[PDB]
């Protein structure tokens, strides 16, 4: 009976006295945690060992029994430093003991503190556990209460105030609860023996350790290794977790502004795109315009005006990979697609369902297609709606839904389908032996102007900050050029759907300078670059 | 409220709804048409540095001020139920400056009582997050995204003071 | 047990003070009584929580944090208000023991919840 | 001209500078009584007339200057002892609103003497270091209760130390000023 | 008068100047005497150096400690003169002013104020105001829709500590009444609220500046 | 409308204030917005032309009592708000330059009026620093003196240099034990560290 | 810790109705109209007439409360901050003093009706208001030792009353309430109506009364003081006779009871 008091006294004196140099680090941490309504304490094992090794020995022998005592000691200290009501505090641990590989845990480790690491592969939803709980006695209508703690309980049968064999029920109207969550840990990929599928474990956490990690992240874990009921005399193992380890600044935008006022920025950005590829100036310019894009607009009568850009390319393999790397968001695919959804979408079967291809998935970003001619039959017709409307709509087999397809498409191949694109060009080649020799020398080196990341961040900044408008002079220029070309064709087609593309190219060109208005300088370069032919 | 104060210069540019009481020639450029008159009972949104004068100068003054949305009844109820949870930054960036300007303009009594309680109640949690020094980021960061431009200066000048005292002491 | 009565009294004071809810009770009752002699509206009322805040803060927070102890007596007080108002005589067998009280609903300014 | 962080307040370095001008009692290990010091901001007779192991009073900065070398020893103030600090903690607990009547420079002087003069105390230093912490924590609780009475007119404080006031200054004054601005705007 | 007392007065002036919102008057006599003493002490240190090491160490570091305070004080005063330049000029131009500018400022401060005002006037006059119409070319305009002249906030809140009369003449001070069974006290009226408070000796307060300006001038209180 | 350009200009003042405040060591105030200021002054000239034309119509008698008064008054307010914006921006950059003048006593970002302004203020500072009150170094350190003697390590190879106290030879990664009052200037210049 | 720091008629009636009930203790001041005099007297007269009618019909307290409570909002409001309602109530009572002081039968009828109205309004109060109103009237509890010595007798006395009046059917609940209940000691002659029903414990000529009972003492003090004031009001009726414009109204008011 007295041992429960001495241990609590010992941990209470541990928190109140541990200085390293001049700061009571744990008194300060426990005060600073309460002010932000965080009821927990993060103790370090090495400091506990340094203070008194006997306390660590007791903790190491019987963790399941001794952890609650230290927690209630934390509560007793927490009340003194902040009151002249609080819940029970959560203890959290850090350690540097030798990691056990997940594959080696066995019957020798049951009810021991264990440190391991792996990859999280799944996460459950949150669930409720009880800590303080009230009880009603059915016969006499007497009432009492119980305090649960979550370490390895059932309702009692010692009736009070005969009173009967099993008279107790719960008043949920006057009880307290906490959160709980389940996780799955899979062993590290570079530790598995050859020819075997990786092994995994299941584990639990509660209160502040919940909702701290997501699937696919590599983590390190400290926790008690134990068993639970779910052959003969055989039980399942698991782990109780006690600890886990896993927009612009001003100085950034100053650099981007300095770039914006450079008189030769357009040349600089074109030169920075696929520098190994020789020639093909207008291709690089068109890719800059594709990356930057126009400006979206919405009108009083509800009509909606597109912002995206679309380009086709008729060597060519490299540029799509570069566009994938430089773009803020990017998807890469070949014409047949990743599944039966193809590029756009399809219905599959047993009840029917629907899944989207690599036009729905790239919504909000860029998508590049490696061979546009290998497009499937359904996608040939569906890309019309995917490009013009930026939507995909299906009414089949009782399904009736519409999907968003807001993206800019880059494509390459080697007909009427060319009408959907804003610009079309044909790739050109040159055959200097020095170029091939340089490439070969670089290949042997691995076998034996603006950088990508800076350019990507700059593109993000320009997309976020500016959305320019046409000046009146540009309007007069464009309308005169439009009627001029149509008259020239008449005496010898251009249509409104291409004028509205020239406008988007003009806005994208004005976007680089961060000029709020587009000007005749941009209109001239726009119509100059319009010569797809 | 100094002349050269940038925040006061910037706060005066916020627009308020207005209604006219005379037809006037040539001032259609306020309606973005320089070639036309303004007509009586037309409604426009004008910056405060202009509406503050056109509401006063005569008699009947030229313009009447309509009750703006940022002082609507819904905002007042939201303030009075739970001031600490409120996202004043989304409501208006310069709330406590425009509040004082409006109170001076119309000499409101009840609005002052509401605003004083709001400021006093939010200062408590502001001090709580100021005092909490590391020996955490998410718990502080969630609240500090709902501060006005007015409150951020007080938070910064409190945090630096506490930090300097701590640094000097434990040195 | 005694606290139940005082909360009923306090909500009766609230219902007497803000009179727009009496009109709702009476309008529903007279509408139902009219067409019965020849559709029927439910025995439900929606209260603004802001009125309850401005009337009594202690009752407002009691409703909003301890509903199990505050919602039932207020509903009982509403049933008493609707019952005291005049009603059609000679009810049938089913009407005499319906076990059908009035019920509440809320709108406005939940705040953190 | 002046730095931005010194427009309205004193930095802790200036607070240390202010505290250093106070007098303190010392035991010198050398006799100076029959060159001479010839100071211009203090008394000069005491340093010129020292006798070994005879108690005397000098400014704190000269005392720390001497204690840097063997030539001096510093007597602790009488309040800086275990019995007195126990009594002050009991006073703090007994009266849940009043501040105990500690001197205005207690934190600064304690954290100077523990560093420069750890060897001259009579009590064990590791207990004083705890009782100082207890006093500061209790006072911080009492401060946190007090910030709910910021108002348009004034406030009263008693026995609150210089460093504690300097810690809080920019918050109290700013919030009080804005409440003043909101109130007077309705009158005008 | 003694060298000991002048440094206490300097510390008093420095601390008061740091906190108060207005520009307080220059101590003309104290600064003359202090600067002369600094010069003499420097020459004495040089003579003794050319002639135990420890007294020289004390003298040198004492002179450093003395010079730092004056440096900070003068920098603060010049910073204040920057902010209230047009206000001080308008105060001087008012023939009916109860105090002259030369009473408030030292000669060096007068030079700084005048020439800095001319420099700043030349900068904006050529750049901006060269292009404005004649009605808006004034720089210190009071009549415009916004007042172009800044001035101190007389109602700023400040910490104070009540000293009482400096001589300990509690029986002689006419303002110093007494509370029941306790210390003497002063009384002040806060006029916006029509309310009174009792300022006991020794207790600390947060108080509006204008309400306690007269007692501060008479050294009955000291800013914390 | 006539206040849009000013509302855009003042945001640069707020931006440069925050950039300056974030890092006291990295003061390089950005490019003077010549173009926006020129556009604002052109707008003011347009308003002046409009007022002059309105005065001509007033002398012609075109309903001048009400019509000219109100239009003229509204134009006057539009001019005044622009004056406020320009003065605020220039005053902020003036304050930054005044802060830099005290420590120093490169030029491409400053406008030429500001370029001569800085020279004038440097002349003023050295005039105050000379003459009477010379005994206290008004541009010196503002941190109170803590210790007489310190240990300083040698960070940059400036070779042999002269100072009022004497001569030093700054051999890279050597260490001195010397009085702070001597080496305060060299620490500020950046040849030394306190360790 | 931190720390900061005719009109008289209106204040008089705010003081008088802070408790929400009054013994009608003090002389009114200022002026009202003669139309107000007549109408206010008639309103209180109507409520008291219905109270006496229901009592003659032998209806219970609950039935009378159901009958009379809707009439306050029309004739004589209660639990109200309005100065007009408070003055209406006070002045109407004082007028019916002058109407009903004239004879023993009128005095008895007025005392009965007004005391029953006092009981009704007291029942409408919250327990806090009842406590404050009783304390304001300057109205001996036994010691804990005396309660312990007499605990068996007091519990035997009140146990049935706790079950029937306070619905405490469970003996456990009755025991807990009795542990929390206070008792008052006074001479048995003061509570003789409870003595006749054997609702109080008697010892040595003193009656032991639980705190949850004893409202009859309050209403009896109200009735006795009202009777004494009416006897006083009768003695100086010759001063009322100086204004002839009031006598027809009082004759009209008294005619409904004769
Ligand atoms: Zn039982």
Residue numbers in the entry:
A (entry chain 5): 21 to 104, 131 to 198, 205 to 213, 235 to 303, 320 to 335, 348 to 415, 421 to 455, 460 to 524, ...
B (entry chain E): 1 to 58, 68 to 144, 158 to 193
C (entry chain 3): 18 to 55, 90 to 164
D (entry chain D): 2 to 35, 48 to 201
E (entry chain F): 54 to 104, 122 to 294
F (entry chain C): 1 to 105, 119 to 208
G (entry chain A): 1 to 5, 44 to 177, 181 to 299
Publication text:
Pol α-primase is a constitutive heterotetramer composed of a dimeric primase (PRIM1 and PRIM2 in H. sapiens [human], Pri1 and Pri2 in budding yeast) and a dimeric DNA polymerase (POLA1 and POLA2 in human, Pol1 and Pol12 in budding yeast). During eukaryotic DNA replication, Pol α-primase generates primers at replication origins to start leading-strand synthesis and every few hundred nucleotides during discontinuous lagging-strand replication. Pol α-primase binds directly to the leading edge of the CMG (CDC45-MCM-GINS) replicative helicase via a complex interaction network. These interactions position the primase catalytic subunit PRIM1/Pri1 directly above the exit channel for lagging-strand template single-stranded DNA (ssDNA), revealing why priming occurs efficiently only on the lagging-strand template and elucidating a mechanism for Pol α-primase to overcome competition from RPA to initiate primer synthesis.
To assemble budding yeast replisomes associated with Pol α-primase for cryo-EM analysis, CMG was bound to a model replication fork containing a 39 nt 3′ flap, onto which CMG loads, and a 60 nt 5′ ssDNA flap to mimic the unwound lagging-strand template. Fork-bound CMG was incubated with Pol α-primase and the replisome accessory factors Mrc1 and Tof1-Csm3. Pri1 is positioned close to the incoming parental double-stranded DNA (dsDNA) above a channel between the Mcm3 and Mcm5 zinc-finger (ZnF) domains, through which lagging-strand template ssDNA is extruded after strand separation. Pol α (Pol1CTD and Pol12) is situated between the CMG N- and C-tiers, close to Mcm3 and GINS and is coupled to primase via an interaction between Pol1CTD and Pri2NTD. Pri2NTD forms electrostatic interfaces with both the Mcm5 ZnF domain (site a) and the Mcm3 N-terminal helical domain (site b). Site d involves the N-terminal 5 amino acids of Pri2 (Pri2Nterm), where Pri2-F2—invariant in fungal species—docks into a surface-exposed hydrophobic pocket on the GINS subunit Psf2.
